[PDB]
Amino acid sequence: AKTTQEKFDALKEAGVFSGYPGTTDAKLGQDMTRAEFAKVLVKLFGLKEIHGQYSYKDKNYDAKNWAAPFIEAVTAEGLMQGKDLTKKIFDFNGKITVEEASKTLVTALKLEPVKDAQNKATDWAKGYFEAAVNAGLFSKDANPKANATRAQLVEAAFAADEMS
């Protein structure tokens, strides 16, 4: 079985994840913004980027924001809808959590949420986290509410790619 690092290298060659300048360190212990994760989802699932459209009101969510085409693409695909509908806030600088990642991947893979699922996830997410655990995207001992580490995102993305 491939290590996290070998899984990363594969995803990177494929354009789905990136490294950092001037180092081979993949920084598997660090976190990831929701903007970057939207981009991961686009590259992982082969989605079309949507230019010149803005469905959120966050400060600096505009045409100069490199993430908008990715954010719009995952929004149009129904994978993500942001954090509150009435102010139209996506939170692109906020970090992706393991339960949030679970929802997007389970949805994209067309897997079904677990009903009556019992776990430590926020109420809205319990079914998606559990489904994700069952499909081997995250380990059952991951904290649904924590920022997902890049290592966790790599293992999820890799597993997701294998399933798709």
Ligand X SMILES: CO[C@@H]1O[C@@H]2CO[C@](C)(C(=O)O)O[C@H]2[C@H](O[C@@H]2O[C@H](CO)[C@@H](O)[C@H](O)[C@H]2NC(C)=O)[C@@H]1NC(C)=O
For binding to ligand X (CB under 6 A), which residues are involved?
80-85, 100, 103-104, 124
Whether the CB-CB separation of 156 and 105 falls below 8 Å is answered with yes
In the complex, minimum distance from the CB of residue 89 to ligand X, in angstroms, rounded to a whole number: 8
Measured from the CB atom, the residue of 26 and 160 that comes closer to ligand X is: 160
Measured from the CB atom, the residue of 5 and 122 that comes closer to ligand X is: 122
In the complex, minimum distance from the CB of residue 82 to ligand X, in angstroms, rounded to a whole number: 5
User: What residues have CB less than 8 Å from 22, skipping those under 6 apart?
Assistant: none
In the complex, minimum distance from the CB of residue 22 to ligand X, in angstroms, rounded to a whole number: 32
In the complex, minimum distance from the CB of residue 122 to ligand X, in angstroms, rounded to a whole number: 7
Nearest to 117 by CA among 133, 97, 104, 98: 133
Measured from the CB atom, the residue of 11 and 106 that comes closer to ligand X is: 106
In the complex, minimum distance from the CB of residue 25 to ligand X, in angstroms, rounded to a whole number: 28
Q: Which residue is nearest to ligand X (CB)?
A: 124
Measured from the CB atom, the residue of 66 and 124 that comes closer to ligand X is: 124
Q: Phi-psi region for residue 88, left (φ > 0), alpha (ψ -120 to 50) or beta?
A: left
Measured from the CB atom, the residue of 26 and 35 that comes closer to ligand X is: 35
Instruction: Give me the torsion for CA of 59, 54, 132, 107, rounded to 10°.
Output: 160
In angstroms, the Cα distances linking 116 to 65, 80, 102, 106, 128 are: 39, 22, 17, 17, 11
**Which tokens go with 101?**
């990642």
